[PDB]
Amino acid sequence: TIGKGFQMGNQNRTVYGLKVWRVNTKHNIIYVNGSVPGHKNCLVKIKDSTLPAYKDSCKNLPFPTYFPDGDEEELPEDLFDESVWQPSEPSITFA
Amino acid sequence: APWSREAVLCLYRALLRQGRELRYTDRDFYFASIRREFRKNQKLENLEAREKQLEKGLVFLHSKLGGLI
Amino acid sequence: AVQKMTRVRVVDNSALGSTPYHRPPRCIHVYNKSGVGKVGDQILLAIRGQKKKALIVGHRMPGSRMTPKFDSNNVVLIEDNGNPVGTRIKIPIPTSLRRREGEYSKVLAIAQNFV
Amino acid sequence: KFDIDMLVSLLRQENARDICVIQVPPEMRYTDYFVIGSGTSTRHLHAMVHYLVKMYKHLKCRSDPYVKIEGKDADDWLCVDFGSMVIHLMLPETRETYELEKLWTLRSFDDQLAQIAAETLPEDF
Amino acid sequence: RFLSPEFIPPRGRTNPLKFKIERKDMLDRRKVLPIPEFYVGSILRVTTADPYASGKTSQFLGICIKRSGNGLGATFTLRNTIEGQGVEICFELYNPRIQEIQVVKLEKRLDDNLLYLRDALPEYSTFDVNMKPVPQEACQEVPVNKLKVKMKPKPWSKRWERPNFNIKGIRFDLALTEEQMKEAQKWNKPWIEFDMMREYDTSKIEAALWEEIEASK
Amino acid sequence: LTLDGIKDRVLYVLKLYDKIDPEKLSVNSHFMKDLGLDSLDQVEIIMAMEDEFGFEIPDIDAEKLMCPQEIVDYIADKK
RNA sequence: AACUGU
RNA sequence: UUUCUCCCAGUACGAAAGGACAAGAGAAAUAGAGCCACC
């Protein structure tokens, strides 16, 4: 966390249960719901959710990891969640 | 009293036809209320005030019973 | 942001609200778990020496984006039975009250002007 | 699906004495249809109000969530908010006093609108 | 060449890549929804999808009073008085629920911010919602309304008379004596206008943005 | 069409309306004076006749009829 | 009583 | 972290009157840890 000096902060903290909205493969940018502790441009540690509900999510994901070297199927540059409205899509009308 | 009493006969008659053409609403209430509207208001009015009442009814007539559905 | 004191305007045709009165209105209670009252939040208003429930329909506190910020605090009186005290509302009323959690159809069924 | 025509037919079955339906153009940011209903007595009001919701829940609307009933506490005015239509069920005497039909037929020209008055907030001293 | 304010990045340590990605989304969205050129003081009518209503859209008309935000998150506020109630709505340019944007009257006002119009007389802020679009000249600058608004009694939301606000669209003379201005001028901070540490130049950035925006087209 | 059928049917629709008192509801029964009808009162009187016989009567000449037999003739020649 | 960061 | 509503369901149960569980969903509230796209 951001340190505030004598008044504080500068303590390791973890935020749990943050969903991923989109991933940019070209720049390796992951879009994550909510806020993350620390200042902008601050390194963070990311690991799979440890909540009991999401005990085994790696079964439907690249189990060891994603290997671009294998290139089994080239992924899209920008990965979007189904609910997410991509830019250039038609204006949303609440019908 | 009216600028033209002829409009009233045409105005009132269409309201009754619309009531028979008005399905979703309760026909019984529409008939009684509409007849009240003429009886309550048209008995005594001034030319300027009457013009507003008849003008709104004319638009009421000409706009699918003024949106009554 | 309706809160302690907060001079308000009674947008209703209720006899107590309609009649002018000398005393500025000091709202007493906000019917919410939180202490701040916003649009659609029930509140208790003292009018003509009497206490009547009121529903907020406008506020001067800065609001969320894409919404109109009202220049006056507007309220509508609601009876104990749940029917509105007044049969008419004059100020434009936001239509978000319909989706807002609670019973707002009656008040909306009394609001002529919608923005 | 649950639509305007189905409910009004159901309203006829439960014998609503007064039914009024007002459509609203898209420009107005409110419900497509506003409906006003009447019933002889509070017991009749409760029965008809429950019937429409029970039919609504059975009649598909799985995508839509369950609709809570508003105004059941009041013995003279009950209102149910459905997805595309709002039905306000009251007594005949209660109906005429409120004049909901005038509100929507005359959006801003209803007579009782003028009857509203204002107030003051001056400094006492 | 009118470069919209949102494209201009603010000074900071934020990654330039974020702006490039944000601009791409902004440029791509602009194709879906046309964002007309407008300035504060212009009356606009904006069509937006209504979430509370079901399958219904609405148009709101008001004078543009303030522009804020940058990038995809940029928003604009337009003010109007409806049924005697002053209303200001902050519209996000790239929100998918804005169906269409129409500049009913493209014009500018004396000040870049018109929040003082709340303290001005209602007529200066009253605009007909149904007013039809007025003609505009493409090969001209937007008309600048130089009418000076009259204020309400001295108690205001903000002390516009102060040099910090420096509002040029207020009839201070009518409502304020010269002595009151001197009291307000006690906060002049004349050194501020002469300080070069508060100056940030985006002319080069603005010029560069123009080609990038046009290239995307 | 039967003129007598229209005469008694026109009288019948006039009889149906309740507000007017059929003290003398003759085939020549007048409206403004015999029935004491206001400007609006004659309106609905014509309307009841209009409903029975397929309407399409305009007031330009209806307010001039002033009696059931005259409308009977107007109905007879228009059918 | 109002007034204001009390 | 806690509360409320909904759902399950007017179902189970019960002669009726009346009326649940658990599981699931949505709202909030407070506490804790944070965050500045917007206001």
UniProtKB/Swiss-Prot annotation, chain C:
It comes from the Eukaryota. GO terms for molecular function: structural constituent of ribosome. Keywords: Mitochondrion, Ribonucleoprotein, Ribosomal protein, Transit peptide. One of its GO terms (biological process) is mitochondrial translation. It is found in: Mitochondrion. One of its GO terms (cellular component) is mitochondrial large ribosomal subunit. Belongs to the universal ribosomal protein uL14 family. May form part of 2 intersubunit bridges in the assembled ribosome. Upon binding to MALSU1, intersubunit bridge formation is blocked, preventing ribosome formation and repressing translation. Component of the mitochondrial ribosome large subunit (39S) which comprises a 16S rRNA and about 50 distinct proteins. Interacts with MALSU1. This is Large ribosomal subunit protein uL14m. It comes from Mus musculus (Mouse). The gene is Mrpl14. The chain holds residues 31 to 145 of 145 of the full protein.
From Swiss-Prot, chain D:
One of its GO terms (biological process) is ribosomal large subunit biogenesis. Its main location: mitochondrion. GO terms for cellular component: cytosol; mitochondrial matrix; mitochondrion. It is found in: Mitochondrion matrix. It comes from the Eukaryota. Keywords: Mitochondrion, Ribosome biogenesis. The keyword Transmembrane does not apply. GO terms for molecular function: mitochondrial large ribosomal subunit binding. Associates with the mitochondrial ribosome large subunit (39S) via interaction with MRPL12 and/or MRPL14. The interaction generates steric hindrance that is expected to prevent premature association of the 28S and 39S ribosomal subunits. Identified in a complex composed of MALSU1, MIEF1 upstream open reading frame protein and NDUFAB1; within the trimeric complex, MIEF1 upstream open reading frame protein functions as a bridging scaffold that interacts with MALSU1 on one side, and with NDUFAB1 on the other side. Interacts with MRPL12 and MRPL14. Belongs to the Iojap/RsfS family. This is Mitochondrial assembly of ribosomal large subunit protein 1. It comes from Mus musculus (Mouse). The chain holds residues 85 to 209 of 228 of the full protein.
Curated annotation (Swiss-Prot), chain E:
Component of the mitochondrial ribosome large subunit (39S) which comprises a 16S rRNA and about 50 distinct proteins. This is Large ribosomal subunit protein bL19m. The lineage of its organism: Eukaryota, Metazoa, Chordata, Craniata, Vertebrata. It comes from the Eukaryota. Its main location: mitochondrion. The gene is Mrpl19. GO terms for biological process: mitochondrial translation. It is found in: Mitochondrion. The chain holds residues 74 to 290 of 292 of the full protein. It comes from Mus musculus. Belongs to the bacterial ribosomal protein bL19 family. Disulfide bonds: none annotated. Keywords: Mitochondrion, Phosphoprotein, Ribonucleoprotein, Ribosomal protein, Transit peptide. One of its GO terms (cellular component) is mitochondrial inner membrane. Coiled coil: none annotated. GO terms for molecular function: structural constituent of ribosome. The modification Phosphoserine is found at residue 4.
Curated annotation (Swiss-Prot), chain F:
Carrier of the growing fatty acid chain in fatty acid biosynthesis. Accessory and non-catalytic subunit of the mitochondrial membrane respiratory chain NADH dehydrogenase (Complex I), which functions in the transfer of electrons from NADH to the respiratory chain. Accessory protein, of the core iron-sulfur cluster (ISC) assembly complex, that regulates, in association with LYRM4, the stability and the cysteine desulfurase activity of NFS1 and participates in the [2Fe-2S] clusters assembly on the scaffolding protein ISCU. Mammalian complex I is composed of 45 different subunits. Interacts with ETFRF1. Identified in a complex composed of MALSU1, MIEF1 upstream open reading frame protein and NDUFAB1; within the trimeric complex, MIEF1 upstream open reading frame protein functions as a bridging scaffold that interacts with MALSU1 on one side, and with NDUFAB1 on the other side. The complex interacts with the mitochondrial large ribosomal subunit. Interacts with alpha-1-microglobulin chain; this interaction is required for the maintenance of mitochondrial redox homeostasis. Residues 4-79 form the Carrier domain. The modification O-(pantetheine 4'-phosphoryl)serine is found at residue 39. It comes from Mus musculus. The modification N6-acetyllysine is found at residue 15. The keyword Cell inner membrane does not apply. Phosphopantetheinylation at Ser-39 is essential for interactions with LYR motif-containing proteins. The keyword Lipid metabolism applies. It is found in: Mitochondrion.
